[PDB]
Amino acid sequence: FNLDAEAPAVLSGPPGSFFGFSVEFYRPGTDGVSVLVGAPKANTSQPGVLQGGAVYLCPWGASPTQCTPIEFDSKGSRLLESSLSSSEGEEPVEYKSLQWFGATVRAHGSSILACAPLYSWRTEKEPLSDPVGTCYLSTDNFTRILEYAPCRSDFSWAAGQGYCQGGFSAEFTKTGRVVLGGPGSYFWQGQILSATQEQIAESYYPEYLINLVQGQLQTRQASSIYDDSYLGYSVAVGEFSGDDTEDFVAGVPKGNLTYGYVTILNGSDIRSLYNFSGEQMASYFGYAVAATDVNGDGLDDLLVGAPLLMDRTPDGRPQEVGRVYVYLQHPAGIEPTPTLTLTGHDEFGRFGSSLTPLGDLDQDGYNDVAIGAPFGGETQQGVVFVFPGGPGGLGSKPSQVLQPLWAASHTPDFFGSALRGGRDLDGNGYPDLIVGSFGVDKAVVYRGRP
Amino acid sequence: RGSKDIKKNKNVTNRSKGTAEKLKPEDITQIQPQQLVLRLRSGEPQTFTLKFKRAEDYPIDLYYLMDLSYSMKDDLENVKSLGTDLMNEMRRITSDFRIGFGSFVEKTVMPYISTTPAKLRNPCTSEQNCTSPFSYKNVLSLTNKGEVFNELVGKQRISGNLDSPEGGFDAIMQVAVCGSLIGWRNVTRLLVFSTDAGFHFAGDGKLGGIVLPNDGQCHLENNMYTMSHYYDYPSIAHLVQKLSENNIQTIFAVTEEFQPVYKELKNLIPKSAVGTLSANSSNVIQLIIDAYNSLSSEVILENGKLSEGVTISYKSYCKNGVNGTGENGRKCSNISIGDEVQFEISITSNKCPKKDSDSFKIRPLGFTEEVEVILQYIC
C-alpha cells in the first residue's frame, strides 16, 4: 500500500523495440545501483544484423535517467569457414537477425546474463536452421564477456537439442550458478540446463562453436509420450530440501494431456523432488512460477500462474480469468494441493501471467507478492496487484493496484507483463519494484514509501 | 408486489397437416413465449414456464475443416467423394443441405516450421512432393452443389510442418467469425473439425515471438489467412465465446490416439460432439450422422448478462419425468423430432437498479430464436 504510485519514474526506449520486455536490478558493488531493461527487437550497431535486440543500462539517481545500450557483442554473424575457400561464396554459419537478444535479463553481483531465445544456427555439417538459442555472460562488471550456448551441441535437430531455444527462461541461484530452460529439446519435451560461472569460464573456447562445458547439469531425454510438454517454459530457484543448495522450480505447461504441472528439481543433482498438477485443461498451469516464503516460517513456498483458466460467473456465463495457486511448505514437505488460490476478475485479463517476490514491502515481517494481469483494467492496458503476506499465508485481497498513468493507444500496453522486485534502489530499508510495459516501450520504477 | 405479463406467445409450428406445409427458416417456430415483462419487488422472485418443441425439417449448413499434414493424404483421398456421399445421406435428414471445405496446417514462423529456403519450398521429403506450409485456406464457401465440392477437394495439395501439434484453432476462429465470406445462414450450423494430432493454443506463440493475443476479427484476403504471423493462437475460452456467439455446433472427428484429449475439449466446449475417426477417414459420414443426432437430441439454454442485483435460476422438465435443477436445470436430453419439453425460469432482484426498464434475452444454444424478457423494478 506504500508504493509511490502518484509519481513513478518512467523509462523510455526506441519505438517498436519492445523496450521493457524484461527488467532486472543491477549493482556491481560500490552502490552503483542500476536498472537493466531488455529490448528484444531493438536495432544495434552490429554489421549486417537487423533487429538483433539490445540491453540498456539505466543508472539510478541524478534526477533524469538516460538509458544507454550495452555492447555484449559488437560482431556480426560469423561466416562458415568452409564457405571462405569454397567457390560457391561465403555463407553465414549463424543467424543473429531477429534473435530477440535481451528477451530475458538476469543479474547477480557484478555478473549479467542476457539470452537470445530466437537465435538460430546452421550446423557445420548440414545446412539446418536450428534455433538453439544463446546467452552472453558478463563477468566482473563487463571486464569479460563469455558466450554460453549449452544447447548448441552434437544433437543437432528437433529430434535432439537443435530446437532447444535455450535461454527462453533463466535465473541465478544465490551462489551465482546459471540455470537455463529450453522448451524445445527432444521434440519439445523441454530441458533444464545449469552450470557454474567458474565452469563456464574454465571451459570457454570461443573458436569451437560446439564446446561442452565440463560439469554441466541437465535433465535426461525421455520417451516419446512426453513430447510437447514445454519443460522449462518458466524457471525459478528456491530451497525445497534439507540442504543449502537452491533447487530448481520449472514449469511444464503442456505436460499431462495439456494439463500443466510444475516440477521441483533437486539442486545438487538435477532430479525430480515434487510434482504439482493443474486443474483445468489448457489453462497453461505453469506459465509463470515463483518461490518465496509468504507465511514467515523461513521455508520457501511455491506460486504457480495459470493465466488462461476459465471460470463461470454466478449468472452462468463462462469467462477467461487466470488463476494463481499457492503451496505452503512445511517441515514434513509440501503437500500436492494448493493451500490458496487467487482468481482474476477482468475477462481475458490473464491474471497469473507474471509473478515476483516483493520482499517485505511494508516491513511487517512477512514477504509480499506482486501479480500482473497484462490485459486487465477498464481500458485493457494491464494491471499489477500487490498481495500481502501473513502468518496464515498470502492474503486474499490486494493491498494495492498499479495501473498506467498514460492514456490508452491503438495497441496494448502490456503493462505488468514483466516484473522484478525485492531490491532497494534508494538505500532505504524498503524494496522497490520495476514493471515492464513493452507494448509502449516503457518501464516504470515504483519505490516503497516508509 | 411483483407482477408478470406476456406480450408475444405465438404457438409452435407443428405442420401436422402434412408435407404440404413448407415453411421458411424464419417461419418455423420452436420456442413458444417470445416476449415477457416482469415487475420485481426487492427480494421477490418471479417465474414463468418456457416451452420448446423440436422442428422436423430444419435446413443444415456443414463446413468441413480438414488438417493437411502428410499423414492425412490417405484421408483426403477418401474425403474426395464426401461432396456426393454426405449429401445423399443428409437428404434423409433435411431437404436443404449445403457444404463447404477448408484446410489448415500450421503457423508459418520460425519454431513451428523449418525456415531454410528448401524446406519452405517443400516441408516434406523430396519424394513426398508437399506444398509450402500455410495457416488457413477457405477452399469452398458453403454451397449446395456436391460435384463442385468433389472437384475442388480433389485438386488440393498436401503439406506438412515440423511439430506434431497443429494450428487448427486459428482456422476455427476464422471460420466462426468470417461470416459472409463463408456463407453461413440462420440455420443449423455444423463445423466438422478433422485431424489426427493435438492442437496449439494461446501462449504457444511466445516461442515464435508472437505475443499479441488473437483479436477475433476476420483476416481473410484471397481466401487466405494473412495474420497468422501476427496474432497468437486463440484460447479455448475465446473459442467457446465465439462459437457460442455465432451458433456454431462443432463435431471433433479425431483418430483413436487423441480421443482422451478431445473428449476433455468437448467437455469444455458447449454444444460439441466427438467421434473416433479412422486412419483414412472411411467412417466420417457415420461420425457426422451420429454426432448430428447427438447434438440435435439435446437442448441447452443461454441467457445474457444480468444487472448487478438480478439473479436467475432454471428448472427443466424433460421427457419421462426426468427433471433437473441448477446448472443441470437449463438442459434437456432425448428431445426427439416433434417432442415437447418445458423449463421453469425464476428471476429475482435484491436491489433497485435506478427504476430503469431493464431487459435481457434467453435462447437455446445453436438457434437464432430468442425470448425477450423485460424487467421493471418496484422502487
Epitope: E124, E126, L128, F155, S156, A159 | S126
Partner: antibody, heavy 119, light 107 residues
Framework: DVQLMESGPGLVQPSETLSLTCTVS????????VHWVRQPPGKGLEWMGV???????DYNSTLKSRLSISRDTSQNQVFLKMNSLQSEDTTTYYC??????????????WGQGVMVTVS | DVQMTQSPSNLAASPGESVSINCKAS??????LAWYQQKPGKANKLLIY???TLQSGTPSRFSGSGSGTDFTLTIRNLEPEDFGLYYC?????????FGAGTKLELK
C-alpha cells in the same frame, strides 16, 4: 544388423556413363545419409557426394558437374552416375552411412567397395 | 576444408607388441576424430570416435588419445588379426576428409 552392399559394372569404356548401386539393409534411407567415397589406385579416400536423408543431394565441388546421385526408397537402393575417364582406372568406390539430424556421428558403416576398370 | 595427414605410412610389428599411429589435422578440430580398420576382404570398421570413445564391439586393447590438431591411436597387445589398414576421419565439419592410411605388417 546394418549392412551396405555395393554393385556396379566391373569394366566400362571411357565414353560410357558409370552407374553404381548401393543396396542397404537394417535401416531406412529416410533416416540416414548415404555418402559416396572413392579411393584412387594409390591415394587416400576422397569424398564424392551425399544423398541427404531428406532426398536432396550435395556433391564435391570439383566433381559436381559430372556427378548425379539418386535413390529409390522402395528398393532401399542409392545410385551414382558419373562420366567415365581412363585416368580414373582401377579406382575403388565405397558407400557409407552417417547421421546429421539428431545424434550426429562419423561414417559408422561402410560397404566392401567395388573396383571399376576403364579401358 | 580440413586436410588430415597420417604420419606412419607403414609399420612393422610382431604379435604381443604395442604400436602407435599418429594422425594430424591442418586446423584445430577439438576432439572429433574417428579411427577405422580395414581388413583385406571385409568392409571398413569403426573403432573409435570423438577421439577416445570406443565403438561397442571394439576390443579394449584399442585406445585413442589427443585433441586439437594431434591425435594418436594405440594398440596395446597385437593379436594376429589386428594387422591391416587404419584410417582417421575428422567429423567436425563437412565435407568429410580422411587420412592417407597406415599399413601394419608383421616384423
Amino acid at each position: 544388423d546394418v549392412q551396405l552392399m555395393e554393385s556396379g559394372p566391373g569394366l566400362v569404356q571411357p565414353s560410357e556413363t558409370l552407374s553404381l548401386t548401393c543396396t542397404v539393409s537394417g535401416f531406412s534411407l529416410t533416416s540416414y545419409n548415404v555418402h559416396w567415397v572413392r579411393q584412387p589406385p594409390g591415394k587416400g579416400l576422397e569424398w564424392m557426394g551425399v544423398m541427404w536423408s531428406g532426398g536432396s543431394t550435395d556433391y564435391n565441388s570439383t566433381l559436381k558437374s559430372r556427378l548425379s546421385i539418386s535413390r529409390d526408397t522402395s528398393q532401399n537402393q542409392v545410385f551414382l552416375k558419373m562420366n567415365s575417364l581412363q585416368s580414373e582406372d582401377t579406382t575403388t568406390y565405397y558407400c557409407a552411412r552417417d547421421r546429421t539430424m539428431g545424434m550426429t556421428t562419423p561414417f559408422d558403416y561402410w560397404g566392401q567397395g567395388v573396383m571399376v576398370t576403364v579401358s | 576444408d580440413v586436410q588430415m595427414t597420417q604420419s606412419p605410412s607403414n609399420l612393422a610389428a610382431s604379435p604381443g607388441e604395442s604400436v602407435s599411429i599418429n594422425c594430424k589435422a591442418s586446423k584445430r578440430i577439438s576432439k572429433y576424430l574417428a579411427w577405422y580398420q580395414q581388413k583385406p576382404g571385409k568392409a571398413n570398421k569403426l573403432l573409435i570416435y570423438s577421439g577416445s570413445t570406443l565403438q561397442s564391439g571394439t576390443p579394449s586393447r584399442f585406445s585413442g588419445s589427443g585433441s586439437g590438431t594431434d591425435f594418436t591411436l594405440t594398440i596395446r597387445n597385437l593379436e594376429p588379426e589386428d594387422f591391416g589398414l587404419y584410417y582417421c576421419q575428422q567429423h567436425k565439419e563437412y565435407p568429410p576428409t580422411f587420412g592417407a592410411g597406415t599399413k601394419l605388417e608383421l616384423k
